[PDB]
Every structure is written in structure tokens, then in C-alpha cells.
């Protein structure tokens, strides 16, 4: 009598992924966004970014200069490249909670990382 959730038989093509994400201080978060496809992804400033404790993600504004906001090391992402997203937070993260960052490119492509 063996039960398990989802399948490692069941897979789909990945064209974009967050290789790693974590907080670097009490109020800054770093994510490495990796294009493993064959297409350039442009206008990443028009991505939508959400971040928060699990189940309570909040929107994050692009490069507004005032927390919470996010920056990216390049506005476009070529095949095989990585760019670095940073989130500047207004309130400090708690040491005993798990957080999710999620990024939605203009093309709708949706990736997440939990730490």
C-alpha cells in the first residue's frame, strides 16, 4: 500500500528557471534567473514579481527606488544566460518562516523559488 504525490515520470520542457534564490540580509533577496531555452526574453522590466511568506505573496514594483522594489542586472535575457534579480524589502524577514519569490515575464512565463 504505497502512496506518493506528483510524478517523476511526468515532466515538461523548461525554458526558464530560478537556479537559486535566498535572502542576503534581513531585507534584501537575491534570485538567479536562468534562460535554458533558445529564445531571447526581452523587456524584463515589464515582468511582474511577487514575493512574500508562503501563501501571502505581495507584488513588488520595478526599480521604484523605495521598498519594496526590485532590480534586474539586464532588461533582456539571451539563451543560456543568467541575470540577477534583487528585492529590497521594507520589513525584515523572519528567521522561522519560508518565503517564495515568483516571476512572470511579459510572455506570461511563470517561475518560482522557495527558501
Amino acid at each position: 500500500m504505497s502512496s506518493y504525490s506528483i510524478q517523476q515520470s511526468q515532466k515538461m520542457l523548461t525554458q526558464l528557471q530560478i537556479d537559486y534564490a535566498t535572502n542576503t540580509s534581513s531585507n534584501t533577496v537575491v534570485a538567479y534567473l536562468h534562460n535554458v531555452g533558445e529564445t531571447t526574453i526581452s523587456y524584463l522590466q515589464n515582468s511582474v514579481v511577487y514575493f512574500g511568506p508562503n501563501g501571502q505573496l505581495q507584488p513588488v514594483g520595478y526599480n521604484s527606488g523605495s521598498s519594496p522594489y526590485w532590480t534586474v542586472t539586464s532588461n533582456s535575457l539571451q539563451p543560456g544566460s543568467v541575470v540577477k534579480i534583487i528585492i529590497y524589502l521594507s520589513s525584515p524577514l523572519s528567521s522561522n518562516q519560508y518565503y517564495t519569490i515568483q516571476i512572470v515575464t511579459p510572455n506570461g512565463y511563470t517561475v518560482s523559488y522557495m527558501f
Binding site: 504505497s2 506528483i6 510524478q7 506570461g108 522557495m114
Partner: protein
Amino acid sequence: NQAQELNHELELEQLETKITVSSVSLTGSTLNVVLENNGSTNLYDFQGFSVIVQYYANISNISTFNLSLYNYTKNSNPSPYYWTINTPLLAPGSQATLTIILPYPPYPNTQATVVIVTNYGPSVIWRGSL
């Protein structure tokens, strides 16, 4: 953007959805699977679920591989190839009994695989003996 916000919501619900099998029990051709919601999403769109059962049917005393997909019904006395569940919405932490009407009684003590897929994507596979 709207497609962006739709995909945002959907992926969060896939991350938040999780189900497990507490137990499985057979009576005749009727398979009752106790399912528990270990996620943080409500589950109620059962017409978007999948139920697939691979098992060994007793056909004139011959153990005969059967693989079928079962369709959901609100009907409390479902026909063969149909399934139903004794709750209108399965909330986090709750359990319900999912009733699957097999077309033939299982051959005794044969292996079986039951696949249950939520409407969001996440699923559970149960393997055991019937």
C-alpha cells in the same frame, strides 16, 4: 497584464495544492479511497479532476488487465466508469471518500494503481493490492 496575473495566480495554486491517500477499501466492484487535503487550497472543481485506475479484473475467472479513466458525477449512485465524492468541497486538513465504480470486480490479491489528479495539476498515485 492579464495573462501575467492569471499565470501568477494559477502557479501559486499549483504550489499550494496537495492531496494524499489515507486508505483504500474494496467491496465488490466499488472502490472507496479516503483522500486527504494536505494543501492550503480548497478543492471542489471535481469535473476538472482525473481518476484513472489500472487494475486486474476478474472476467470469467481470468485475471485481465484493465486501464480506464473514470468521469465524475454528482449522482450519488454512479454507473460503471464513474466516480463521485461524499463532500461538495474538500477543505485543507479535511478528508473525504471518493467512490469509484469499476466495470468488473478485481481479481483477488492483484496489484492496482489508482491515479487521482486535482484540477490544478498536482496529483497522487496509490499502488497496492486489491
